[PDB]
Amino acid sequence: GSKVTFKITLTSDPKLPFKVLSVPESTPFTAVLKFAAEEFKVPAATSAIITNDGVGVNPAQPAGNIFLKHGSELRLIPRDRVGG
Amino acid sequence: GSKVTFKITLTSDPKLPFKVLSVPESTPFTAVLKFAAEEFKVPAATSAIITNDGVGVNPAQPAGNIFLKHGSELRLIPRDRVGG
Amino acid sequence: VNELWFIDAQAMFQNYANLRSFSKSNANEINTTIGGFVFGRKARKQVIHVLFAYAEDLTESNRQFLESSLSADIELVGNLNIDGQSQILPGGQFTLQLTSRMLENRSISEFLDMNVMFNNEHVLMEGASCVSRVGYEWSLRAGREQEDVKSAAERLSMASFRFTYLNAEHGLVIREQKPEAAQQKYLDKFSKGAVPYKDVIEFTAMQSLTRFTRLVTIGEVVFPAFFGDSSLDLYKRSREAFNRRANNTMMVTVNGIRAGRGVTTTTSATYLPPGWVSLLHLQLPTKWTDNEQRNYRIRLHKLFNLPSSKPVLRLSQALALHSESARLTNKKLIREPHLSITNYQPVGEITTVNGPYNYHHYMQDGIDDSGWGSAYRSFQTIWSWFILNGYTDKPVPSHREIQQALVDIQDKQAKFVGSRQWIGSTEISFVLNELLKLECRFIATNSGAEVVERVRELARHFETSGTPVMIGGNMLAHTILGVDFNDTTGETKFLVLDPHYTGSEDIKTITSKGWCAWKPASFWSKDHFYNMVLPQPPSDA
Amino acid sequence: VNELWFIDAQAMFQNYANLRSFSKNTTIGGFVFGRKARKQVIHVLFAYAEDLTESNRQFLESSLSADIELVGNLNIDGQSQILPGGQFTLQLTSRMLENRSISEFLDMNVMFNNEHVLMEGASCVSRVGYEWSLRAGREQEDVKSAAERLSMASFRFTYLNAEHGLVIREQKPEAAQQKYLDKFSKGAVPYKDVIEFTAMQSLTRDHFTRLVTIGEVVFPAFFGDSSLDLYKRSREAFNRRANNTMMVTVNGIRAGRGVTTTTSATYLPPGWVSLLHLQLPTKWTDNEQRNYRIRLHKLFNLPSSKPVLRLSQALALHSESARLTNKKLIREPHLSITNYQPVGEITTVNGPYNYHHYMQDGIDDSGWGSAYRSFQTIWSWFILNGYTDKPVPSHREIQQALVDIQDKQAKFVGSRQWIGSTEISFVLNELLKLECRFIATNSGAEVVERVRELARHFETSGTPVMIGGNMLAHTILGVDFNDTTGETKFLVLDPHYTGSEDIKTITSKGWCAWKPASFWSKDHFYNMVLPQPPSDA
């Protein structure tokens, strides 16, 4: 349907480079995460999206949901994987 | 006709009494101030209206504008007179 | 002049706010006026519990239910009156004169102006808790169950003086004594600088060996032991404590038949609800429809002035005072290790977790999860906080259960389910959201120095959410339970629970060998990025 | 290694934020100004690419005190334009600026240590004029060259103080009188301690538009510097002002605003530890001045919220500087407090204000002017912080206002009748269109247990608070509050009868001191009016 627009900001790169995306609300947010990740040249498999205030975001749902739940300002942080 | 509504709490009485007034928006707020203080049986010349969060209210304007600027929740406090 | 009373006026204001909380529609409803009862330590004139109640619940039948639920040294000491238009049930020795403005503004000064013989005091919790598991049996004639149960409990209190409580470990014994045989300063070695929820002396309740429908109610009985307590002082209380539980078991059983569920056995639970400095002693029905249960929860909240936000009286929230008392997820698991520490002294301001939790280390759940399990293990410590604080009753998931959630939520794959793979905070946040519908917040850093710089964000979290925090970076996963931070020195210390593997349930190792102690700010590597997940608790009882 | 440069990183971070507060993506760079002698940084000025120009680094340096110069530049990430100069280049990232982390800074800039840089030295000030003849048709060319020659001729000037017998002049190194102005520049502060001189010129050397520019020249006198050190700075001070006058004049010409006269002004913008020297185009349109006033906020990394470079808040260091207040009145008496130990957290006024009290303006308000005086102090704050040019109203002007809005009926105007917290808010609204908030209490005890409301006000609005109650009016300038022991104290500017501009008598006696919570009566209700500053600069 109609489009929602996000602004994802890379926190791993101290330049803090953002990227503005606009997808229809029916688009699964994993596609937005994917595009923004490869656009930032970071792997989407070990990157994660949190909201502007710190709330984690589950990308496995329509973009319309993410917008109303969390907003338009998001951040792409890295996924820490540790065991040891 | 088209009228606004205020909830004025008397903050000098420990029971926190309140009068609710639905006055026409054309009403000079000096009339509301005088009449509210009348129903609390307190002198209007020794009282003053402030909003809920503290903002001082100028009663010289119509009740319509005073409802746009400040909310419906007001507080009738007592004036101090302090020549020390 | 001489009869000055002491009261935590600030805590009284909160209790009123907690009762008023169930309305959330002030001046919108039409209701009966609000009165209340004042409970406290009559001997020293110290008000401990101020319980507000709408009018209907200002009855003799209800006041007895409250007083039988409070600790043994506390009794009815007065009423209260809001705006001079509350109902007063005759009793006590005074009547608190409160006003609407006082209770809204929370003006301590205005309370003291109206109640002249009262002095505000931040009341703290004193003394330890003596506990013993006690059983008794009642016989109810068919058709006269309700008639007998009131009487069967009457003569039980009359024979509650022939009891003897014995602690085998330290050779401690409390029984009826002649006033001159009283052993002064008896349990001062145990009650000095102690707190009711942590310091516990366990006794076995014994009786002299030479002295229709059936009903047997086994259950614990808790009475406090203070510093300077005589041996006789402990006896008087240990008796009054048992009488109250029996009356409570009676009262709960009687009105159970009047409400439909008939005659049911009762499980005994003891709580330390948010803000209280004394304990709550309750007898809860074991059988009833879920409608009957949730209504019983709501009402106990209203009666004892408990919040409508936090869950408080869930069975899993009940204190583990007695050893034979049943437990939800406390296998060999240690509850709240960080509390068994006095090695430490503050370097400044200190804020810690708000609630119980269990230490989940390596290899403890059968299988050996060596160097990959650390992230899973901290997830489990978090989950324990949610069951021990009444947010759920689902058990702490196994490693396979965790990994399956990641596959179900479509993050990591089916082979992931099988594996010994590594995860982190970001996967933890996903499982909490899938299994518990939880929301998590993150502190995303790029260095271990930034972790120290953004300590205020941690201190805020523990002050507002209280949930334990896992931290993941430098191939290691940890659990942060507190933080010590001086906002003038810049000196910063971290309280860390190490998910890495200790032998077994032994605090002496854990406390002293560093597995659960305070760490310097240099604990985090400055060369690696760190993430912290901050699990956020819901807002419903 | 011990060639360590010192820098107040927190002050730099604020200046970055102050620049960023004008947005709403061209890159961002900046210049680093400081005392090259002792290897210390005093000013870190950020600017976008467009403005990293030799033309612009000269405007900045002409506006700074004579002792500080360009010591280097900076580079955020690695994507900022840089104008080659100085000894170093600060390596910053866009992320260590957003969050403001000193840790990341000190790691990327090794030869640097963090230090809370403080105010030093006194301020020597003198009035100076000079005529410029501009050949019509090429006035831009002539004013530029006129400033050149003036910087060449500036070395033969002589500043001399008559009262103390001091003389700043050209000297050979062996004529230097060490420790010259030490008894003037010891524990001194630029914004307060001044040493006024008279500027004199040797008689051995001197269609169109003439331009007589006359203003002031301020140069710092530190501790332990010699007469030669004073001289070298006194010349650089003059040159910079002369260039400053030329740049704006040129700027005015090119903007088609012609050749206009200027007004010299000296500031200490919020957070700084060195003065700001500017030549203001006072003959432009009010709007034209505002846009220029705006630009300087961007160029000097100043807030976009509150006014800073308004004439009203310009420091009056020279005795001939035109004031918008009363020169007799004491400015910021609480700052001259003698040795107070805080019991807890502290929070005071954020801005300058004047002490108005009884028997001041030829009126004897023995008992009834307490509220009027407290009103006046607040009005001073709004003048001294660039919110108004209009002077402090008299008792009769205030009473007239209350009558004007129909609140006291004209019997009041000629009256010695009392007012209070409310009436103050009415006048402020009528004259300055201000908004006011209140803290209405029922006992002085409530005033104490609602300290957190005051501290929040002083932390966000800054304006002084008038407090009426128990038939007495006062002015609260700050609260000392420990949220653990519960002990609270109040900084109270007593409007109750000074009668003698005298500071030592103020501090010694009960006027303007830290009063305990026991001050406010537990039997009477108090009101507190909280003046709210407007949103433009």
Q: Are C252 and C283 in contact (CB under 8 A)?
A: yes
Q: Are C248 and C280 in contact (CB under 8 A)?
A: no
C-alpha atoms less than 13 angstroms from C-alpha of C132 in its C-beta half-sphere: 26
**Tokens encoding C195:** 């707190």
**Total residues found in chain B within this entry:** 84
**Tokens encoding C33:** 């006026």
- Nearest CA among C93, C92, C6 for reference residue C44: C6
How far apart are the C-alpha atoms of C423 and C375, rounded to whole Å? 6
How far apart are the C-alpha atoms of A21 and C6, rounded to whole Å? 63
Coil vs helix vs strand at D289:
helix
Residue-range definition of the domain harbouring residue D344: 330-532
Pairing mode of beta strands A73-78, A3-10: parallel
How far apart are the C-alpha atoms of D334 and A25, rounded to whole Å? 59
Coil vs helix vs strand at C326:
coil
Please name the helix (run of DSSP H) or strand (run of DSSP E) that holds residue B8, with its range, or none.
Answer: strand B3-10
Per-residue CA distances from C304 to A37, C200, C271, D181 (Å):
53, 24, 12, 75
Within 8 A of C428 by CB-CB distance, chain A residues are none
How far apart are the C-alpha atoms of D156 and D174, rounded to whole Å? 18
Phi (first) and psi of residue A37, to 5 degrees: -70, -50
**Residue type, position D406, single letter:** Q
How far apart are the C-alpha atoms of A82 and C374, rounded to whole Å? 8
CA C21 to chain centre: 20
DSSP per-residue codes, A23-67: EETTSBHHHHHHHHHHHTT--GGGEEEEETTSBB---SSBHHHHH
Instruction: Using CA atoms of C503, C507, C511, C514 in order, give the dihedral in degrees to the nearest 10.
Output: 10
Contacts of D343 (CB under 8 A, 6+ apart): D480, D482, D485, D487, D488, D489
Please name the helix (run of DSSP H) or strand (run of DSSP E) that holds residue D472, with its range, or none.
Answer: strand D472-481
Q: Do D442 and B79 make contact, defined as CB atoms within 8 angstroms? A: no
How far apart are the C-alpha atoms of D47 and D52, rounded to whole Å? 7
**Tokens encoding D53:** 């120009």
Interface of A with D in 1-40 (CB under 8 A): 11, 14-16
Please tell me if residue B81 touches chain C, with a CB cutoff of 8 Å. Answer: no
How far apart are the C-alpha atoms of C345 and C288, rounded to whole Å? 49
Count helices and strands (H / E) in chain B: 2, 4
Q: Do A55 and C411 make contact, defined as CB atoms within 8 angstroms? A: no
Nearest Cα of chain B lies from the Cα of C110 at a distance, in angstroms, of: 10
Pairing mode of beta strands B73-78, B3-10: parallel
Residues C340, C390, C537, CA angle at the centre, nearest 5°? Answer: 90
Within 8 A of D103 by CB-CB distance, chain C residues are 447, 449-450, 452-453
Q: Do A80 and C473 make contact, defined as CB atoms within 8 angstroms? A: yes
Contacts of C311 (CB under 8 A, 6+ apart): C317, C389, C390, C391, C540, C541
Distance spanning both ends of chain A, measured CA to CA? 46
As beta bridge partners, residue D40 has D6, D35
Q: Do D94 and A11 make contact, defined as CB atoms within 8 angstroms? A: no
Please tell me if residue B55 touches chain C, with a CB cutoff of 8 Å. Answer: no
Within 8 A of C452 by CB-CB distance, chain D residues are 103
As beta bridge partners, residue D280 has D263
Q: Which chains are within 8 Å of C by 3+ CB pairs? A: A, B, D
**Residue type, position D478, single letter:** G
Q: Do D443 and C108 make contact, defined as CB atoms within 8 angstroms? A: no
Please tell me if residue C457 touches chain D, with a CB cutoff of 8 Å. Answer: no
- Nearest CA among B42, B36, B41, B3 for reference residue B20: B36
DSSP per-residue codes, C181-241: G--TTTTHHHHTT--TTT-EEEEEEEE-TT--EEEEEEEEEEEEE-TT--HHHHHHHHHHH
Please name the helix (run of DSSP H) or strand (run of DSSP E) that holds residue C425, with its range, or none.
Answer: helix C425-435
Q: Are C226 and C127 in contact (CB under 8 A)?
A: yes
Q: Are A75 and A65 in contact (CB under 8 A)?
A: no
Q: Provide the b/e sequence for C340-378 (b: ≥16 CB within 10 Å).
A: eeeeeeeeeebbbbbbbbbbbbbebbeeebeebbbbbbb
**Tokens encoding D308:** 């800073």
State the best of C107, C455, C530 to mutate against chain D, taking most chain D CBs within 10 Å.
C107
Per-residue CA distances from D321 to D266, D276, D388 (Å):
10, 16, 18
Please tell me if residue C188 touches chain B, with a CB cutoff of 8 Å. Answer: no
How far apart are the C-alpha atoms of D205 and D153, rounded to whole Å? 9
Contacts of C467 (CB under 8 A, 6+ apart): C353, C355, C382, C385, C386, C461, C534, C535, C536, C537
Phi (first) and psi of residue C344, to 5 degrees: -90, 150
Nearest Cα of chain D lies from the Cα of B74 at a distance, in angstroms, of: 12
In D361-450, where does DSSP find H-type helix? 370-384, 395-404, 421-432, 444-448
How far apart are the C-alpha atoms of C104 and C96, rounded to whole Å? 16
- Nearest CA among C9, C268, C284, C267 for reference residue C123: C9
Per-residue CA distances from B79 to B40, B44, C506, D388, D465 (Å):
15, 9, 67, 28, 16
Q: What domains are defined for chain A?
A: 1-84 (3.10.20.90)
Q: What is the DSSP letter of C358?
A: B
In C115-173, where does DSSP find H-type helix? 145-152, 154-158
Nearest Cα of chain C lies from the Cα of D48 at a distance, in angstroms, of: 27
Q: Looking at the partner chain, which of A56, A77, A82 has a beta carbon nearest the beta carbon of C477?
A: A82
Q: At what angle do helices C425-435 and C399-408 cross, to 10 degrees?
A: 80
Order the strands of the C46-54 sheet from edge to edge. C95-98, C75-82, C34-41, C46-54, C5-7, C118-120
Q: Provide the b/e sequence for D155-177 (b: ≥16 CB within 10 Å).
A: eebbbebeeeebbbbebeeeeee
- The residue to which tokens 């000055």 are assigned: C4
**Residue type, position D278, single letter:** L
Chain breaks in chain C (C to N over 2.5 A) after: 211
Q: Do A15 and D96 make contact, defined as CB atoms within 8 angstroms? A: no
What count of other Cβ atoms lies within 10 Å of the Cβ of residue D133? 12
Residues D377, D468, D464, CA angle at the centre, nearest 5°? Answer: 30
**Residue type, position C513, single letter:** K
**Residue type, position C485, single letter:** F
Q: Do B82 and D525 make contact, defined as CB atoms within 8 angstroms? A: no
Contacts of C515 (CB under 8 A, 6+ apart): C361, C497, C498, C500, C502, C509
Q: Looking at the partner chain, which of B11, B13, B14 has a beta carbon nearest the beta carbon of C102?
A: B14
**Tokens encoding C247:** 């009356």
Query: Could you tell me if residue C284 is left (phi over 0), alpha (psi between -120 and 50 degrees) or otherwise beta?
Result: beta
As beta bridge partners, residue C511 has none
Q: Are C473 and C529 in contact (CB under 8 A)?
A: yes
| 3-class secondary structure per residue, D435-453 | EEEECCCCCHHHHHCCHHH
State the best of D23, D80, D94, D100 to mutate against chain A, taking most chain A CBs within 10 Å.
D94
How far apart are the C-alpha atoms of C469 and C482, rounded to whole Å? 9
- Nearest CA among C245, C312, C324, C320 for reference residue C276: C312
Q: Do A54 and C534 make contact, defined as CB atoms within 8 angstroms? A: yes
Please tell me if residue B42 touches chain D, with a CB cutoff of 8 Å. Answer: no
- Nearest CA among C222, C47, C234 for reference residue C134: C222
Greatest alpha-carbon pair distance for chain A in Å reads: 47
**Residue type, position D452, single letter:** R
Coil vs helix vs strand at C427:
helix
How far apart are the C-alpha atoms of B21 and D34, rounded to whole Å? 64
Q: Are C94 and C78 in contact (CB under 8 A)?
A: yes
As beta bridge partners, residue C216 has C137
Nearest Cα of chain C lies from the Cα of B60 at a distance, in angstroms, of: 29
Please name the helix (run of DSSP H) or strand (run of DSSP E) that holds residue C53, with its range, or none.
Answer: strand C46-54
- Nearest CA among C472, C499, C500, C497 for reference residue C482: C497
**Residue type, position C146, single letter:** Q
Report how this structure was experimentally obtained. X-ray
Pairing mode of beta strands D488-493, D513-516: antiparallel
Contacts of C428 (CB under 8 A, 6+ apart): C375, C378, C379, C382, C440, C470, C533
Chain breaks in chain D (C to N over 2.5 A) after: 24, 206
Per-residue CA distances from D253 to C216, D7, D294, D406 (Å):
103, 38, 19, 51
How far apart are the C-alpha atoms of D537 and B37, rounded to whole Å? 40
Q: Are D372 and B84 in contact (CB under 8 A)?
A: no
C-alpha atoms less than 13 angstroms from C-alpha of C266 in its C-beta half-sphere: 30
Residues D490, D495, D501, CA angle at the centre, nearest 5°? Answer: 110
Nearest Cα of chain D lies from the Cα of A71 at a distance, in angstroms, of: 19
Pairing mode of beta strands C5-7, C118-120: parallel
Q: At what angle do helices D54-63 and D286-299 cross, to 10 degrees?
A: 100
Contacts of D72 (CB under 8 A, 6+ apart): D31, D32, D85, D86, D87, D88, D89, D90
Please tell me if residue A50 touches chain C, with a CB cutoff of 8 Å. Answer: yes
Q: What is the DSSP letter of C334?
A: P
How far apart are the C-alpha atoms of A67 and A70, rounded to whole Å? 5
Interface of C with A in 439-458 (CB under 8 A): 439-444, 446
DSSP per-residue codes, D156-208: GEEEEETTTTEEEE---GGG--SSTTTTTSSS--TTT-EEEEEEEE-TT----
**Tokens encoding C347:** 């370097």
Within 8 A of B15 by CB-CB distance, chain C residues are 83, 99-101
Contacts of C143 (CB under 8 A, 6+ apart): none
Nearest CA in chain A to C444: A77
Q: What is the DSSP letter of D392?
A: P
Residues D485, D491, D497, CA angle at the centre, nearest 5°? Answer: 145
Residue C471, judged by CB atoms within 10 A of its CB (0-12, 13-18, 19+), counts as: buried
Interface of D with A in 76-95 (CB under 8 A): 77, 79, 93-95
**Residue type, position D531, single letter:** P
Nearest CA in chain D to A13: D95
Per-residue CA distances from D170 to C244, D39, D160 (Å):
98, 27, 12
Q: Provide the b/e sequence for D404-435 (b: ≥16 CB within 10 Å).
A: eeebbeeebbebeebbbbbbbbbbbbbbeebb
**Total residues found in chain A within this entry:** 84
Residue D524, judged by CB atoms within 10 A of its CB (0-12, 13-18, 19+), counts as: middle
How far apart are the C-alpha atoms of C246 and C203, rounded to whole Å? 18
Give the CATH number for residue C462. 3.90.70.130
| 3-class secondary structure per residue, C448-491 | HHHHHHCHHHHHHHHHHCCCCEEEEECCEEEEEEEEEECCCCCC
Per-residue CA distances from C53 to C61, C110, C282, D165, D389 (Å):
13, 22, 18, 84, 60
- The residue to which tokens 């008087």 are assigned: C236
| B and A in touch (3+ CB pairs within 8 angstroms) | no
Q: Are D348 and D476 in contact (CB under 8 A)?
A: no
- The residue to which tokens 């941690």 are assigned: C458
Q: Are C262 and C256 in contact (CB under 8 A)?
A: yes
Q: Do D421 and B78 make contact, defined as CB atoms within 8 angstroms? A: no
How far apart are the C-alpha atoms of D13 and D46, rounded to whole Å? 10
Distance spanning both ends of chain B, measured CA to CA? 48
